[PDB]
Structures are given as structure tokens and as C-alpha cells.
Amino acid sequence: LPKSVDWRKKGYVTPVKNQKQCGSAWAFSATGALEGQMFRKTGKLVSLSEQNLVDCSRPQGNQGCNGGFMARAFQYVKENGGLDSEESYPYVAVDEICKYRPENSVAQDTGFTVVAPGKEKALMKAVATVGPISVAMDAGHSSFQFYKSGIYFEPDCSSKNLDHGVLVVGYGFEGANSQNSKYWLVKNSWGPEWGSNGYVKIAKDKNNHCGIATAASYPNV
Ligand SMILES: [Cl-]
Ligand SMILES: [Cl-]
């Protein structure tokens, strides 16, 4: 596998969005993964609707602004036959009436693939071969809230009890040795002002830190 990967440098990733006061990170992680897979398929980067997921995927088990899971979102897109664009179905950060319109759909998936649970090397392989990957993580720490630079490492992090969905857009390392001071490149949904332009470097090959490889998946387009 490559020593480092960053799909942002290849055009697969939209600018950082902001879920605001709605527990919809699962939806942003899902649209993020879908955006990259659709780009791989068509060469066009089109921002996708998190509000369409929030409003319409309760049947698949999501709970709108009160939480959800990326796999259930990819399941909804499959069963639904489509997903609208961000422009056509804008984000308002509150649970609303499902207004899915097929004519505005710009994405589809046939289901999703799960990364072997808990294996950072499996996640490394998925990231290098597929594109950005949706992952769950333990983000319940002030250290994460006020993260700004460096490789994030939090001793109180859990690899099993997760509360936030994010997007792995690559991986890398500091220095000249590709085999140490490694990190996962993670896109968050708390706006570009949070973290490092909306991103965070999370310690990689440090025992599945914060659960990054516990529940990773990607849509099949
Ligand atoms: Cl999930
Ligand atoms: Cl940057």
C-alpha cells in the first residue's frame, strides 16, 4: 500500500460542512463517502444532501437530529433509488418533512461494504484502494472540541463506545520515516473553523485509537 494517501488532492472531497446543533454527523459522514464514490464513478464532484438523509431515513433506523449510522444511510439510498443534491435539498439542521425528489437525485448506491472491524490495516487498504471511508469515532472529549494541530491522541478515548461519524480521506506520517508518527486524515462536520480547516490528524497504528477502524464502511456505486 502507499506510504500516504490524501483524496483531497485528487478532487474527491467537498469543502468542510457544518452540522450545527443537530446530531447528524452520521449523515455528513455518509454524504462524504458517497461524494467520493460518485466522483470516482463519473469525474464530477457534487455536494450531496445531508437534510435528505435526516428527513427521510427513519425507516432504515436513523433518528434525524438525534443520531444515526452511516450504514443505515447507505441502506436508505439503496432502497430509495437515489439521493438529492445539497443544492436541491439544503441543510437546516432540524428534523423536517421528507421532501425527496427523484428528479434531483445525483447519487445512487447498491448497498455498502464493511471494513473488517477493528483492523487498522484493513482500513488502510480500503482508504488506499477505494476513496474516502465513513468511520465512527469517540469524539466525546474537550480535547477533541478544542483540537487545532498535531496528531490527536486522547487517553480517555474508547475504541468501542463511539459517538460520532466522520470521514477518513487519507493517511500519512510526519517526518521522513513512513513507518512511525502515523496518522489518519479525518474530515469533520463542525465547520472549517473547527480543528485544522475542519480536519484532524488522528494517531494511526496506536491500537485503533478512538475506534477509527471499529465501524468503517463505504457505499457501493
Ligand atoms: Cl455505520
Ligand atoms: Cl488544510
Numbering used by the authors: 1 to 221
What does the report in the manuscript say about this coordinate set?
Addressing the elusive specificity of cysteine cathepsins, which in contrast to caspases and trypsin-like proteases lack strict specificity determining P1 pocket, calls for innovative approaches. Hence, we set out to determine the crystal structures of cathepsin complexes with representative peptides of cleaved substrates. As a working model, cathepsin V was chosen because of the resolution of diffracting crystals (up to 1.3 Å) and crystal packing with accessible active site cleft. Reactive site mutants C25A and C25S of cathepsin V were used in structural studies.
The pattern II group (binding shifted to the non-primed side) consisted of structures of nine protected peptides and one non-protected peptide that all bound uncleaved into the non-primed sites. Electron density maps of the peptides enabled the unambiguous interpretation of residues from P3–P1. The nitrogen of the amide protection group at the peptide C-terminus was bound approximately 3 Å away from the ND of catalytic H164. The amide likely shared a hydrogen bond with the deprotonated His residue. At P4 and beyond, the features of the electron density maps became weaker and less precise; however, it was possible to model the peptides KPKKKTK, RLSAKP, GNYKEAKK, and EVCKKKK up to P8 in the averaged kick Fo-Fc omit maps. MPD molecules were bound to the primed sites of all structures. Three sequences TRESEDLE, EVCKKKK, and IILKEK were among examples of cathepsin V single protein cleavages, but they were cleaved two or three times in the peptidyl form. Peptides from patterns I and IV bound to cathepsin V consistent with the observed protein cleavage sites, whereas the peptides from patterns II and III did not bind according to their cleavage site found in proteins. Their binding appeared to be biased by the absence of the negative charge of the reactive site Cys, which caused a shift in binding. Similarly, the binding of C-terminal carbonyl from amide of peptides of group II, as well as the binding of carboxylic terminus from the cleaved peptides of groups I and IV, can be explained.
